Design an enzyme around this catalytic site. Sequence first.
Site, PDB file in Angstrom:
ATOM      1  CG  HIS A 156      -2.091  -1.039   1.013  1.00 52.73           C
ATOM      2  ND1 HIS A 156      -2.188  -2.114   1.868  1.00 52.73           N
ATOM      3  CD2 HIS A 156      -3.109  -1.097   0.123  1.00 52.73           C
ATOM      4  CE1 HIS A 156      -3.251  -2.797   1.473  1.00 52.73           C
ATOM      5  NE2 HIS A 156      -3.840  -2.221   0.431  1.00 52.73           N
ATOM      6  CG  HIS A 168      -1.907   0.108  -4.237  1.00 56.16           C
ATOM      7  ND1 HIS A 168      -2.463  -0.878  -5.028  1.00 56.16           N
ATOM      8  CD2 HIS A 168      -2.861   0.594  -3.411  1.00 56.16           C
ATOM      9  CE1 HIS A 168      -3.733  -0.960  -4.663  1.00 56.16           C
ATOM     10  NE2 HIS A 168      -4.021  -0.091  -3.698  1.00 56.16           N
ATOM     11  CG  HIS A 202      -7.154   3.996  -3.316  1.00 55.62           C
ATOM     12  ND1 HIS A 202      -6.128   4.020  -4.239  1.00 55.62           N
ATOM     13  CD2 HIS A 202      -7.248   2.750  -2.796  1.00 55.62           C
ATOM     14  CE1 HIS A 202      -5.619   2.799  -4.238  1.00 55.62           C
ATOM     15  NE2 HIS A 202      -6.268   2.000  -3.393  1.00 55.62           N
ATOM     16  CG  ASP A 203      -4.954   2.079  -0.166  1.00 57.08           C
ATOM     17  OD1 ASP A 203      -5.734   1.987   0.808  1.00 57.08           O
ATOM     18  OD2 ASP A 203      -4.888   1.223  -1.071  1.00 57.08           O
ATOM     19  CG  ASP A 252      -8.082  -1.060  -4.000  1.00 59.03           C
ATOM     20  OD1 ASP A 252      -6.896  -0.662  -4.042  1.00 59.03           O
ATOM     21  OD2 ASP A 252      -8.693  -1.270  -2.939  1.00 59.03           O
ATOM     22  CD  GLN A 282      -3.493 -14.763  -4.747  1.00 63.19           C
ATOM     23  OE1 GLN A 282      -3.512 -14.170  -5.828  1.00 63.19           O
ATOM     24  NE2 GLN A 282      -3.771 -14.155  -3.605  1.00 63.19           N
TER      25      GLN A 282
END
Length: 323
Positions: free
Chosen positions: A79, A83, A117-118, A228, A280
């Site tokens: 993050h 990113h 956003h992060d 995202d 995953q």
Amino acid sequence: HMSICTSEEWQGLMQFTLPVRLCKEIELFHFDIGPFENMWPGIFVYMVHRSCGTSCFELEKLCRFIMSVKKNYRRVPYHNWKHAVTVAHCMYAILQNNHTLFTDLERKGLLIACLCHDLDHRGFSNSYLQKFDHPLAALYSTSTMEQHHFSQTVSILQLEGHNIFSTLSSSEYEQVLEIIRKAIIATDLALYFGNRKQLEEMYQTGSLNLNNQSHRDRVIGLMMTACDLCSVTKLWPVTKLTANDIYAEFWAEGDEMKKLGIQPIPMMDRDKKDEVPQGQLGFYNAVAIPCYTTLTQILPPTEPLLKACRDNLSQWEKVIRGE
Ligand SMILES: CC(C)(CO)n1c(=O)[nH]c2c3cccnc3n(-c3ccccc3)c(=O)c21
Ligand SMILES: [Mg+2]
Ligand SMILES: [Zn+2]
């Protein structure tokens, strides 16, 4: 308080020129920003100028905002600043392929929301902060980090010569800050499941209407999730390397839980690496594939994202099988 960019940082960004070899590559969904680190802030400027315009924001104010957002991103394994630009690029690609469906204000708000956003992510999930009573969790009961990311976005804009939206009318400024707020909140994965389920219902029944503001917010919310999670839509070696980065952040969170005597979930346990391919597989089947499937149904030009996600699912399936 927020970290401010140096005079040399934004001045260099203003002088940046994007190579002609990349302007054609940047338009494609599967584009990886990874091998062009020094060009990341410049890539964003170009993206803003191509989606909105060369004079939508004052070049000086825009360059100051970008470089200051970069400085407020922490040096965590996933993050981070890298990113943010990857998420912003995926938004650019979606907006470019569905340009007229969104307003000038929405295109500006969504690219800025994606880059922010992060903001100031400490490398810990919302469940961690709420369980271990972190100050941020006391200040924000639900969507803890997302409510903090929006607060940091407002704070960067509140800095001297950083307010890129100051030239908008009072009602438009209010509107852009609400577009940004809802978009950043939508990046809380816990909210995605319910949002995608409602959109699937609206699409199947044919009640989905882009003129309806409640439907619009839901579509934008799914776009935010799709951006995202876009690392699952890159070429297999890029996807593979990004998985190592997010797991380094998950395992570090688990290591912290272990120091307190609490056993983390297998996904956050570094002694349980063997379970990652199966984990995953579950993430693609229940989160990634349904996201891009719904997104393709609503916005058909986003079809290459679903195709690339399906390709990576097949690759994880080859890992489990032994191929
Ligand atoms: C998409 C990515 C990074 C691909 O490596 N990924 C993954 O493999 N598992 C996960 C994942 C697994 C569990 C929870 N959140 C996850 N997120 C996530 C984290 C924060 C905010 C929103 C989503 C991923 O991006 C991701
Ligand atoms: Mg987030
Ligand atoms: Zn994110």
